[PDB]
Structure formats: C-alpha cells, structure tokens
Amino acid sequence: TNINFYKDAASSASNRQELQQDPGKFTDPVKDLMVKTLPALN
Amino acid sequence: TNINFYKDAASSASNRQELQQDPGKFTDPVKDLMVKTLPALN
Amino acid sequence: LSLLYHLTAVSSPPAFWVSGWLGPQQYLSYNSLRGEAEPYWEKETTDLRIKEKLFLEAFKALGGKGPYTLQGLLGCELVPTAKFALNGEEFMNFDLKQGTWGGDWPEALAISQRWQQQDKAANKELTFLLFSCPHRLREHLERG
Amino acid sequence: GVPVLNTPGSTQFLTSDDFQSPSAMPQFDETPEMHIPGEVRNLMEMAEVDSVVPVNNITGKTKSMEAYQIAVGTGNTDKTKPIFSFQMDPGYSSVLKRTLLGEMLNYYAHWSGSVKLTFLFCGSAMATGKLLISYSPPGASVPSSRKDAMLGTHIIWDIGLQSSCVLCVPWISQSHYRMVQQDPYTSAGYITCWYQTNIVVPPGAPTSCDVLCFASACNDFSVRLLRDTPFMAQPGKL
Amino acid sequence: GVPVLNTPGSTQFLTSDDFQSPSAMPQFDETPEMHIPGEVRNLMEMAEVDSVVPVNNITGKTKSMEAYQIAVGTGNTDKTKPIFSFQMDPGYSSVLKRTLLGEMLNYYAHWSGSVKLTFLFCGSAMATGKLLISYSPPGASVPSSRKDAMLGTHIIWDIGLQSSCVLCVPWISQSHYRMVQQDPYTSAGYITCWYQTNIVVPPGAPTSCDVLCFASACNDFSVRLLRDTPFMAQPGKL
Amino acid sequence: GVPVLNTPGSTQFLTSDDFQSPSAMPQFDETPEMHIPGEVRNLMEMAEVDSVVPVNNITGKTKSMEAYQIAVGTGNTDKTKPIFSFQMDPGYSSVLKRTLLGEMLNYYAHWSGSVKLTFLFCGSAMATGKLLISYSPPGASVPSSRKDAMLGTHIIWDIGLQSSCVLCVPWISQSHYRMVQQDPYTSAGYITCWYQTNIVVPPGAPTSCDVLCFASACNDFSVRLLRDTPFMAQPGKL
Amino acid sequence: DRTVANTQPSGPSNSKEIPALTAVETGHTSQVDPSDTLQTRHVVNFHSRSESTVENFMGRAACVFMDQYKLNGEETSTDNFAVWTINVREMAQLRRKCELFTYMRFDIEMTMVITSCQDQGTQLEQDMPVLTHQIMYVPPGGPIPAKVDSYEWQTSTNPSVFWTEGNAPARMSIPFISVGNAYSLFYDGWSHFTQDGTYGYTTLNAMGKLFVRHVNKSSPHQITSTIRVYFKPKHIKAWVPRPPRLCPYINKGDVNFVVTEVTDARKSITDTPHPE
Amino acid sequence: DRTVANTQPSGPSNSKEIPALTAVETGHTSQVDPSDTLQTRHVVNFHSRSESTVENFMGRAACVFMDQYKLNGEETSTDNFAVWTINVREMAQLRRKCELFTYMRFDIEMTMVITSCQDQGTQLEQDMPVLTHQIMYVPPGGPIPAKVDSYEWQTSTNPSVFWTEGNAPARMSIPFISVGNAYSLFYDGWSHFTQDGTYGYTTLNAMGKLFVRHVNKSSPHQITSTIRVYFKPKHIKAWVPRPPRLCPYINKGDVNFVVTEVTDARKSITDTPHPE
Amino acid sequence: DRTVANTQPSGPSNSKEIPALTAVETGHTSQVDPSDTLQTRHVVNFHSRSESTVENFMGRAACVFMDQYKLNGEETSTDNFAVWTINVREMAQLRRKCELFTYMRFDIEMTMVITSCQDQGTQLEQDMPVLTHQIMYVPPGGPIPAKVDSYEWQTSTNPSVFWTEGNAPARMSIPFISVGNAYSLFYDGWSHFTQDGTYGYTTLNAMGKLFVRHVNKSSPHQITSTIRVYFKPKHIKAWVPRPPRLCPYINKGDVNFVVTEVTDARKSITDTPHPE
Amino acid sequence: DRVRSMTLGNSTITTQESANVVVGYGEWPSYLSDKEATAEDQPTQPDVATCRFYTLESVQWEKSSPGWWWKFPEALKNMGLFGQNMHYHYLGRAGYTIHVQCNASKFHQGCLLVVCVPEAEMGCADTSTTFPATELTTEEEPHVFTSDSITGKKVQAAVCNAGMGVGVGNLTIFPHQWINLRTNNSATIVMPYINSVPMDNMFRHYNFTLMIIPFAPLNFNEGATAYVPVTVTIAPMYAEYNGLRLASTQ
C-alpha cells in the first residue's frame, strides 16, 4: 500500500491514514490561553 | 517507480526527476569570464 | 398555481381515493374500486396505483389494529410539496434530499421504512414530486 | 510475464478507492507550499467550532437574524414553558442542522461524540437571571416541564460576567454511533430551556433579551460513514 | 511498465476468491470493536451445540412440539419394537436435518466427525427404566430387533439422576468425509432406540413419558465443501 | 496468479504519464552518445538567453527588422512621452511574446521568476544620453510620465561604453506563479522607457539611434504547468 | 490451521466415570468423544475445519441484489436506475447465512455483476458503444438521485465506481459502515423509544443506499441491465450465532414468516429410509 | 490513527472552577468535555476520525463535469467534442465540499467515466467498432481545439489520455496546477487591478481546459457519449475552512445565490419532533 | 529536484560595480538577479523547474500521425492500411517542440490511439467482432506492404504490435533508431554530396516506415479507423536548442514557410493594454 | 482579562471590557519568509508607517441594522501610508489586527458576530449578473446587510445568509470575536496574512471581509443612548510590499 509505483508525487495514493488535527486553530484561537476551569473574562 | 520491468533501456520511464541545467552554455558562452559587477568591456 | 393530489385511504372502510386539485378547482377523482384516474391518463393511473399500493403497505405497516385514516397532499407548486397525515394529524414528510419519508412520529418512520422496502418506491416518489407533478401541472396549464 | 488473475473489483471506478494513477504532467514542479495560516486537517475541527444555532425556526423568523436569537424575556407569562425545545441530533433536526456541526454531520451517515451547546446571552449587562438547559436522553417524551427537565442531564446557567455557559451534552447513545438521517433507532435526546429564575431587569434595561446557541463538537466527537449531503440537491447545470 | 500476461482466471468473479479490492471509503474510521460476548468463529461451534432433534416426524406431530418429543411409555405393547428409528446422516435425513447440526451440514457438501446424540428424559422423577440406543454402521439393514441393535454400536441409558445419557456415535465411515446429500455411497448408519427394560412408573406417575434427542458435534467433527443450502429455495423477490 | 484490481485510470493513454512499455526492438544497440556541444537540459536555459524583443509592434514595422529596434532620437519633441510602453507578461503581451522567453512561456500555463530586459544601444559611439526604463507593478495604470515611472521599479541607463544596461524586473507578483494567458488576475506590470536626458549627438553623428530589448530569464525563473502553444494553430495536414 | 482433535485410544471401562450419563438440562453440551463412550482406536485426524469458519462460511460470495435498470431514449424515469437500501435481507441465500448470527462485524466486498441484455423489440438494429455503469453507494442520510441524470450522480463525496461492460465485475470493499460496534442481523427492539415505529433489523444497521445507472446518457433502443450485487462478508467477527432459518423468507424488512414444519415429515417415528 | 480523547472520569464538583461558564464572545469555542460539566464514567473511546479528515472527506470522488459529445458523419461541429474550463464549481456536489475551505493544495485525480449510448433514431443498424475517446488537458493559455479533427488534438506537449470503451475509466492524476501556493475556492478580489472585470474564484486558479472527443473519426449513426469527469482531491493541504454552502448553487462562475432560509423552518421555538 | 536560486538580500549600493551596465554585444546574457540591480528581500524560493526540463517538456505526448485506414469487402486497395514515414514533422504541435532543438537523442514512446468508426452509409446493419489492429514499424530499407494482405505483414523481423480495440492504446518504446548519435531536427545540408537532391531533415534521421492495418480480413460494411499515433520523447539528451517555430508549418518535408510577423502587431510602440 | 492595551505603530488601542484577543487560526502575523517568498523585489517593511490602527468611519448600531462588511485591504485605501503603499506597490502582504469598538452602557442589549472571513466571496442580488465594485468595497461608507431578500444589480446583502450563500451563524469557523454589550465593549481579531499566493494586489484582491452582523438586534429602553456606534480600527502589522511601481488610480 505504501509502495509508490509512479515517480510523480501527485500520482501517489490519498493520505487517508494521516490523521492530524489542530482544533486550537479554530476552536481555541485566542491569543491568551483560556482555561476551561478558569473564568474566561476577568 | 525507479524499478524497471523491461530489460531494454529504451523501455524505461521518462527521466522527469532529473533536473539538471547549465545556462552558462547559452547565457554565459563567452570565453573570458564576464562578472556581473565588473564592467563587461574594458 | 399549486397542484395538490389529496391522497386519502382508510384501513377499515372506498378503501383508497385521490382528489387531484390543479389549483382550487378539482380535476382528478381517483378511486380504489375503479382503479383508474377518472377526471396521459394511463401514466397517472399507473402512478396512482403505485400510490394505492404504498398506502396499503402503510396500513400494513402500522402495528395498531384501530382505524387509520391516512392522508397526503402530494404535489408541486410552480417546488414539490409532500405532507402525510395520520388520523388527520400531520406525521411525516418526504425529504427530497434524503429522498425518504420521516418525522418525529414513530408511525412516520414505520411507514417510511415500509415504503422504502418497496422496490424503488422512494425514487418513484422522487420522480412523481420533482418531475411528474410539475410536468403534469405545466401540461394542464397549457391545455387549460 | 508474471501471471496475474483479474480479481473481482477490476476495471471499476470505485469512488472510495486509493489506487495510484499516472500523472498528466510528469515531473511537474509544483509551487512551493507556504505556511498558509488555518491548516484544516479534519472536518471535525470545523464541527468543533462553536457555531450559532438557528434555534428559532419559526416561520418568518428564519431566513433572517431572528432564527439564531432565542428570545428570553422578563415576565411572568409562560415561564413554566420552554424557552426553546428541539432535538439533539445535529444531522436531521431542523434546528441543529444547517450549521457547522449540523452541516458537518450531514456530509456523513454515522456520527458520535458529545455536542457542546454554548449559550451566549445577548442582553443588557444589568440583566440577571437563571436559565436551566436540559438534554433529555431518548426513551421518554420531550420535556414539558422544568421538573421533567432536571431529571435528565441539565445545566443551570447564571446570567452574568461569563454569560456563555455551555451545555456539553453527554454521549448516552445505546450504540457507538448515531444515525445522521432521521432514524427512530439510536436517535439523540431533546434540548429544552427553561426559566430557573426570571431574568430581573432594571427599568432602564430592556425586558426582552436574547440567547444565541453555539453548536460545537468535543474532543470525543467523530463521524464514520461518508455520504453526499442531502442539503444541496442540485437541480441541474449551473 | 512491467510486462504482465493475463493468465486464465482473469476478469472473472469467482465466488470463492480472496482477492483484494479498493475500498469505497478510504481511511474510514470503523467503530471500535467492543468485546461482544458470544464470538462465534467456526460454524461447527454452532453444530457442536446440543440441539433438540425432531425425531418424531409423524404427520401432524411435526410443525409442533410433538416433533422433538420421543414418546417412551410404560407398557408391554411394542416393547420389542423401536422407540424411534432414523438414519444417522444429519444432512439429508429428515429427522436429523433442520437442526443446528443438520442445518449446519446442509450448508456444506462433505462432512465428517462423530455426532453426539444426547437423549434427555422428560418424565416423572419416580420413573425408572433402561433405553438401549444403537447406531448401526451401514452395510446391513436398519435394526429391526434389539438383538440386531446391540451387535453394532450401542449405549444402555439408565433413566435416573442424570437422565441425559448421550450416544456419541463413532466415525466408521469408509471415507474421510461422508456426503451431506442423499448419496448411497459413504452414507452413515441408523439410530434405533429400544426398551432394555420397561420404564416402571408408580401409580401416581404418568405412564407415557418423553425423550428429547440433541444432535451435537464432537471435537472430531468437520465439514469440507461449502454449498448453498437446499432448505431455503427462495421463490422470488421479498 | 496474484490478485490485481483494475484501479481507475487503467487502459487509458494519459498524455503526461511515465509508464514503461515493451520496446519495439529488444536489445537494440543504440549509437554511442558523443559529447555534442550545447546540451540543453531545461527549457528555461533557452528562456534565460537574452533574446531581441520586438518592442516596436507598429504595423508595417513588424514582419521586419524595425520590430526589434526601439527608435531613440535626439530631439525636444515627445521627450516627456514614453520611448516604448508594453506589458511585462512574456506570455500574452504582443511585445514580449514570440521570443525565446515569450515563446518559452507560451508552452506553459504558469510562469514565475524575474525577467531581465537587456537594453542594447545601437547608435553612434559619440552619442550619449540617459534612458530611464521602468517596470511598474500592477495595481495602477501604465506609466504616462517619467515621474510616474520612477515611483515603481526603474533603472537609469547611461549610454556609453557598456550601452547594454539591463532592467532586471523584480518578482512582485501576489502569487507564486503568474498566468501565461491573458488573465487580469496575477498579471505583471508595465515596461515604459523615457528620456532621463536627451541623447546629445555631434553634427557628424546621426540624430535617430536605436535600442534593442533582450528578454531573458534569471536563475529565479521557472514555469509550472505544461500546455500546447497557442501560437502554432495548425490548420491541417502538411 | 489446527485440525480436529484426534480420537484418543480407549478400552473396556467399568469405572464410576459416566461420560455418556450427563445432564443436558444444565445447558451444557456433553464434551464426550467416541473414545469416552465407546472403545475406539488411536487415529490421527487431519480433518481441518478451515473452510468451516465464519470467515470461510461467509467468504463465499452470494447474490444479494437483483434489479433491472434500463437505458432508453430521453424519457427518463425511475426505471433507468436501480435503487437498493443496502441490506443482506433482500436475497434469502445470504440472508440465511447472515441470520445464522445475531451480530457480525465485517468488511463487505460488493461485486456488481452487471449483465446488459437488449430488451426484445420490433427494432433492435442499434449498435451502441460499450455501456459504462456507475454504482454509487449513497451514505445514510446523504442525497439520493431522483433521476438518472440528477446532480447526486456527481459523486463529490459519495463513494462510486464506474465499470465498463466486459471487464472484471466492479468489486468495492465497503468498510464497517455501522453506528454500533456490530451489524444487528436481528434487532428485537423497535425504531422509536415509545415502543412503536418500524420493527426489526431495518431500524439499526441502516446501511446507505446503492444506486446503479448507465453512465451512457441514452440508447437508440432500450437495454435492460441486471445489476446482480453479490456480497462477500470478510474479516468476520460474528457474535451470538443463531440457527439457520427454517421457514422461507417472505419479506426483506421483517422475519415475518408462514409457519413451516420443523423438519421433513416421515411416515413413522420408526421409519428409516434403508435399502431392502 | 489517533482516536478521540477518552472521557475522563468525573465526580460531584462544587469548586470555583466554572467549566460551563465561559465566554464565547472571546471567539474561543469552549474546550469542555462531558466530564467537565457532568459526572461521567471512564470510557476508553476508540472512535477514530480517520474518515473525517479533509484527505478522506475530499477523498470520495464526485462527478464534476457532465457533457454530451457526439460522433456522427462528416459534418463536424462543436457538438463532437466536450469543452470544460476545468473548475470544481460545475457540479454542486463536490463544489460544496471544496467551498467548505478557502484554500486547498491538492493533487487531483481526474477519472473519465465515458458512457457512450447511440442516439435514438429511425436507423440504428450500425455496427461500430469499440469507440476510443481522447481526453486532453489543455494547459492554461495553450491552443484549444476548434474542431474534432483540429491540430490541437495532436498532443505534442498537452497531456492527454486515450481510453478504449469497456476498460477501466481513464484516471489521470493532475498535479498541483496553480500559479499560487493553493487553490482559492473563494476569491473575494477581482480579475483586474482597477477593481473591475471578472469577480470570484474564476479569476485565479485558472486551471487549463479539458477537451474530450472520439478518437474514431466518424460513426454511421450518431452516438452520444457522456464524459462524466469525476474529481478525487488527494494530498489535501486545505486551509481556512468554510461552512458548507447553504443556498443552492445557481452559477458555476460566481457564488451568486437566491436567498435561502438559514435552516428548515419549524412550527415554534418549542417544537420538538418526538413520539407521542 | 534543485529549485531556483533564492533572491539574495540587497541594500542601497553606490559602488563602482555596475551589474545592470554590461555588454550583450559580447553574446553573454547578463547573469544579474533582481538583487543585483534593485534592493530586494531574502526570499527562499522553492519554484522547482522540474516540469520545465527538456525531459518533461518533451515528456508530454502529442499526436504526430493522423490517417484514416479502412476495412471493407475484398477490393483491397491502399486505403485499407495507413502509411507513415515516421517523422515528427507531420503534426505541428510536437514538430515545433522538437524543432526547438537542433539535435535530440531520445527513446520515443509510440502510442497508437486507434479510433474505429463505421463509415456512414445506407446499410450499417453489420455486427463485426472486435477489430484487431496491427501496427508494424518497418525498418528503413526493409520491405513495406503493398496491400493489406501482403507478405510484409508477416513480421519475421520487423517490430509489430497487435492491439485489440477497447484495450489500452498500444504503447511501444522505439529505441534510438538513428545512424548518427542524435536526431537532426534541422539538417541544413543536402541529401547527396553534389549539393543537390532532397534538402532538410528528411535526408538524415530516416526513421523506418510505420504501417497500420486491420488484422481482421474484411468487414461487411466499411469501417474507418483513425490511427492517431502520439509520440512521447523520453530519455531526452537534447542538444543545440532553437527558438520555437514562428511561422505556421506548410510542409512536413521542409521548413518552407509563408512569411509571418515577428509578433502580434500593436497600435504604437507606446501602446500598453491596461485597464482604464 | 477584560482590560487590554495594543500598541501597534503610532496608534494605541486601550480597552477595559474587551474579550480575549483572537489570533486568526492561531498563527500570529509575520513577514513573508524567504522560503515562502515568490518575489525578489526586496519588499519594503514599514514597521510603524503602515502597521498602525487606522480608524474607519463609525457605524451606528441601529435596532433594525442587519449588519455590515468591510473588505479590509481595500477599505484602507487612501487612508494613510498603508493605502499609499497599496497604490504604489503591485504586491502586498499584511497581517491585520482588527479592533472593532462598540461601546454601550450596562442597559444596552445586543450581540454582534464580528467575524473576519477570508475571501468572503459575496453573492449578487440578481444571480445571473455580477455586482460592481462599488457594491462590495466600502464607498464613503461601509456596506450594510439587508434583513430580507433584495434584487437589482447589487451585492446580495441579505443578512439571512452569510453573504456567500452560506449560513451566517456558521461564520464562526473563521476568526471572530462577539461584541456582547453585556461583556464585550469591543472585539479584537488578529488575522494573519491569509491568501493562497504569497503576495497579491491589495486592490485587485480583497484579502477578507470584516462582517459585523448583529445576531441579537440592539434593543435599548428609552432614555438610553440611541446612537450606539460601531467603530472599526485595523492595524496592518507586518505590512510587506513588493512590486513597487506607479500609484494605482483607485
């Protein structure tokens, strides 16, 4: 499966196995860390 | 991709990965080195 | 205008009858005993026979043995409009995207699944609402 | 050459296949990849984002900004009546669909994980009250009184400096994954909001305030089976 | 590329092939596998389970609960006559078919291994008797007397505290595997039950008791050739 | 043999595939490769070569040697008017196309890198002047005065012993690659030449001199997407 | 491949060990071998049960969907595409095998043996190019086609396979598409929590629909193609085995049945089919 | 394949830690799990999100181009070849998935499911050999065919694939053909620097045209082939995700739309579809 | 894959180093980067020129031979086989790319995209089996077929490929078939030593002929097949590059041309196409 | 914390009730890297001349206000040296810190989705045609959404949707900060340079739209300040500029 039969990188398979995520980009985008337990404002 | 399945060398794949260039053949063909910073003539 | 077949059927009766209204005027009076679309007509008769079979299978789909007065308002407004009512209360609607009936009522899901069991019945409904109803509406508007 | 037998599933264009294929342009020099901010690598990262829920699907109120605003008011009228009431399933519930979480689920057939409903108060700063928002697991009817609401899972939201208390509904599904479509089996519960205490406002403050529900997904949230979204339903060529 | 020759057996959908195939949904996140009790990994595990045998195929008695009950009685009448008599082959014998062992074999064409017929007494606790159950290997006729039955393989069952004595019939097949279908060659023997001693019952106990035969499979039991079951015979679309 | 599934993209002649293929003549003894001077290994090496630009596309002047000559003259007339003015894109600009750089780009769909426009003076050795050649990045109109030209990128060329000063235009593209075709988006700037000082000539020297622009490519220059050249447009069989 | 247990050597036994005398009332099948109750010889048995595993028993691919979808003219209808709410129940041959177990976790190979035959007619002169067939698995809840030329055939996210007639049948390994951890071949519960609605397996294991069509827009004369979807359940993790179905199947949505005899009736309890 | 985060065990809490009480006004989605706001049990969750990645979400191949190109006689016209300015927008199914993200860098598998059907006619007696179809991707700015037999079909440098009907659909992996470092699924800017011209994505990501034709010169009777180009975006590096499109698409050049309701209307804010 | 040279950082310079001031009269293209003549920033450029190599530029396969050979009855003529003196010049698309270089040593992939279409006629009822096509490369000087059924089709030593219609187009990698060490795309000399005879490339690089035919002996009704030979020059060792051809090609034997403008004419030397 | 101070360039923004600063997708703005660069024009980097909070025209939050949208690189034209460098440079990269100040008393009700949507391609009121630039980009005044559907050759400013044919309430996927008058007197969204190309024309390309959409309409009892403005200040930190040329006639 990992073997690539074509020299072109665009010819490789879909990177289905690659599970990466950074929800902090969109779900925690604030500059200052907002802890769930701590009050968010003041 | 690099594996060749036919004994004939003409049967191999296109050498797309091979990126070589010598622009000095056509862009710098002068016998005496012409430095960009230095004046070209005299 | 807004074409609306008032489908109606009774589990324990005129077992099944349709009242097609092209606008406020009624133009189609289909009955189960006749089996024909009594006021092109052959195709509508076949479609309404399919609807009659679906209504009979829906009556079989309900577990209760009490009377069930199934109704529906199938048609297109020139947008398809599908609203099914059990015992005079709306219980399910046909989602065109998912292409299947459903609602919060348990009988809604029972009837939807029973009709889905029928061969291509959901897509027969899709063709009837998205394509056949507007085609008949435009044909009747041009004719009348 | 090498003896090969054409196994079943050959000369077929499976839509979900990861087979390789010769490139149209061999040795093509792609543009160097710059670090573009916002690299989304999972669709659930988009689902995890608090997204305003059109809770108020009332006719006319939708296709507008009244759809998202939950009208919470200062009064004695209908304070034992739900502030809002809908079904928890983001997939087929008209309220929780058509949002980041709902539209994310609609692109799949099976979903799982806790849904966080973040309730943001939009009113005067002097306004103070308590709203009890309850997720009731399936098995019974939709809550009709706050007494029936506090029996299930509930959160008491004290309107104040935070004013964005979130009902992070739990995963009390019988199966590991629920159905995105309208399935009576493995369906979710019901979200109903009530007045724990009436929101008392000063004479200078407006009586009728608003609430915005934000559907988001937790670190536990996941979907399983890809499907085409029923929302689009393309009529024809564009 | 690599020179490949299309060998015979290509572009064919063999039903019994283990060829790989591109997936419809690549990188699909399957639901985590919980330890569901009852993991059946071999069909013979199902066959190995004692399963009540409809020995009494008499008309009317079948399609009922009289099919499984072997009526063993307290009397002098027909006590030199078999309590029951059928063929040992679970595949095509009307008695041993349509049960776990029989229906398990019907899904195959060749079967092997010892069959355990567990005979459970269903009568009064005061009832006491002896039943001689005999498996006769093929080569002769079905046993017509208990004298002809004890010559072959037999078990003497003393009705009592256990009351579930099992005739574990041996593997005396000429070939390694018998035929599930009705084949005169490599067929099995015959199971015949007789009254070693009459079941004496007290006046308060009922005279006519019952026996339930349980067809199961041993650790030696196996099947070889898969086939579609002739039992179903689907008429048409459902 | 080995079970193989025909993935999508099979039995197809993709034009940009690097698949292997059986040779017509196996074990063919090719002629030994001699070191032929001029081994071109990249098409951009050809683009990198200064190539005379037909700047003067005026009707009649083209299809001739007047197309390449930029007529720079000794006069007070129209010295606040551009010596020449065209668009920087070698792909679709009528001036910078149909040359080594331009025709090299026309064989592709996306291009990048700095373009060197080498301006060679062809006049009397006694002639002396200053020509200000400016590349203006897109976003504004073509320069209409030398004041608007010096705001952008400009080079002041002192006519003299060198007389081949090059405006090496920078890469101020918003995207990594521009479009070879006539695309309003990611288009290049404009090249406009002006008289910084009038070219003063002695009475024995001719008043009207010439300039030849040479389009070449830098070490930063590259193209991305191959395409058929629109220049040819073959009518039919030859 | 572990073989069957070899019959251990045995001799005459008058001990107090009663192998035959047991109690099946306990729910335990007696584990006695022929050696236990009879005097037998030591035979090294090599009868492997490899083909008798649920992996191999379900490995045989059996047809699960038979429908006739048509190519004809421009009057597109519901007969130009074959619709199937993917369920093992449709065809009884594999339905009985699957209903031999309550829960089965498996990846399911779906092989589409499309057989295109021109419908008998007065005029069959047409010479149509090789028909291409699209088999798209619509995820449960996703949009389903309304016509043969609807937008839903543009498979942006729905899995699909385009197969040209004459090649190997299109085999697509559908993964474990279930909300739960298994497929409930039997579901004794109901669809809704109010003990109403649809009853049976149909409520759970709601596999998404499968739509089959001719990628070719039209045909001079009508041609009917039989999709013949065959299922090969592999990677079987079957749980809670069940007896093979006795009564013939009547419906594909329920296990509703017309009462059938337990087994083939025989003349008498002492009736043995034997040579004379 | 990293699974979801397991729900940590929790108990009754009267602390000053307010997990539920947060501020979504800050633009931060609350990171609270069910344990944070409720008393829950320790369950080891194995619900992998592998199929929920942009690589897998876009991995499903969906149809992007539907056109009917024809083979007939010698009167060559524009109907003998199918022209497509390669754009995801054409078909809404994949257009919505791509327009779920502002920028996506990916290699795009282009699968041509050609379906050739003879056009219904009085005379269909023809017996044409197996039709061969040429699918050429013209680079942006390169020459495009004017007729079905033009010089542009001689693919000296333009990529092309010749596919014979009945084989596997022609799958060609087109590389990242973009002047920029990504594909702008949305382009809020204009075509020209003077804030005029074409508006939308069409200005940028100017993928070169795709021309499909029958390599066979002519056919005794007209045969219409549906190209049905399906796109499989793989090697996804999507940036700046966007909400899935709400209003139905009207045009493939702009996001111009007829206003649609935010969501399905419901009777009342307290209306819950529930069993009685 | 070495990328372009990164633009080195630069600042204000009043030195005696004149990068811009050079002499192109010397025949040397100035090697100045933007940093040399302008103040620029340090940008790490990753714009690879991999697809801009002669290997990749010539890697794109373009059609080189278009001819229509026919199957019909028993009246065999010269129209039943397609004859081609293998030369890149035939089709201008690849001819211009090859004539961008004086000498090119390469192995040439020859792909035959045969498209068979029945010729329009009164009677097309025929149902012919799948047509098989023979593509034989006759070595230069070897015997060439006189008829479609001549002895020369018995390829004892001439390379040939038999391809069945509907499969992948027949791709044969022809090796470096040249008497010299390269292919002279331009040959300024003559055919004979007396400065007479044929002039141009045609004298040298005399690649042997290619004959295409239907292996099927006859067809009830005439079917015309378009051979459509496409060339993919790989293993390129191109020498002495040349400017891309300006004038449209008129003949495939010579570079003879009708004079064309140097470039597209423009209104005035100061005319810039710009937004208003 | 509620109180905050941002000192970017000459201008300084002080807040007392602002919520936490949002960084667009978690990436702080920075100059275009040499590895990520495509142009070799040695871009100018005005650290304070262009990277400062430009205060846009104040917009009154009305009871019936549907919302507003600014195209940021464009809105800042002819407004300081950032606009001057936009005119004088073909390419441009900048990371914009948008502080939207909407101050109100404790007796004012409402909440605004102040969302920065990159490449928020808007739809047209008449779908067949396409709106002119005078309808998208701010023209002496920010462009205002409409409560219901509108027609004509204008931008489809129906606040019913997000303006791109998408759900407006789903816009929170993009970086955003709600101005809830109960809590927020201002919103702070720090969007990095978000574009497919390393640099693009700031007039030809609209990098993003600042959509300020009141989800809860501003409701205040009588006697309270009716004129509740929504000021927009934007600081283009790291405002890189390539392709210097003649000033555009914008």
Numbering used by the authors:
A (entry chain D), B (entry chain D): 28 to 69
C (entry chain E): 5 to 17, 22 to 47, 60 to 98, 105 to 170
D (entry chain C), E (entry chain C), F (entry chain C): 1 to 238
G (entry chain A), H (entry chain A), I (entry chain A): 5 to 280
J (entry chain B): 11 to 260
Extract from the study:
Echovirus 18 (E18), as a member of enterovirus species B, is a significant causative agent of aseptic meningitis and viral encephalitis in children. Echoviruses belong to enterovirus species B (EV-B) of the Enterovirus genus within the Picornaviridae family, which are single-stranded, positive RNA viruses (~30 nm) without a lipid envelope (nonenveloped virus). We describe the mechanism for the entry of certain EV-B serotypes by using FcRn as a two-in-one attachment-and-uncoating receptor. Protomers consist of the capsid protein (VP1, VP2, and VP3) and the smaller internal protein VP4.
Detailed characterizations of mature E18 particles, the E18/FcRn complex under physiological conditions (pH 7.4), and the E18/FcRn complex under acidic conditions (pH 5.5) were performed. The ectodomain of FcRn binds to E18 with high affinity (equilibrium dissociation constant [KD] = 343 nM) at pH 7.4. We found that FcRn binds to virions at its canyon site. VP1 and VP2 interact with domain 3 of FcRn. Specifically, residues T89, I148, P149, and K256 in VP1 form hydrogen bonds (H-bonds) with Q142, K123, N149, and Q143 in FcRn, respectively. S138 and T140 in VP2 form H-bonds with R140 and K80 in FcRn, respectively. All binding sites that interacted with FcRn (T89, I148, P149, and K256) of protein VP1 and T140 of protein VP2 were conserved, while S138 of protein VP2 contained an S138N substitution in many prevalent strains worldwide. The binding of FcRn had a minimal impact on the overall capsid structure. Rotation of residues around the pocket caused by FcRn binding initiates pocket factor release. Consistent with the SPR results, mature E18 particles bound the FcRn-decorated liposomes under neutral pH, and no further conformational changes were observed.
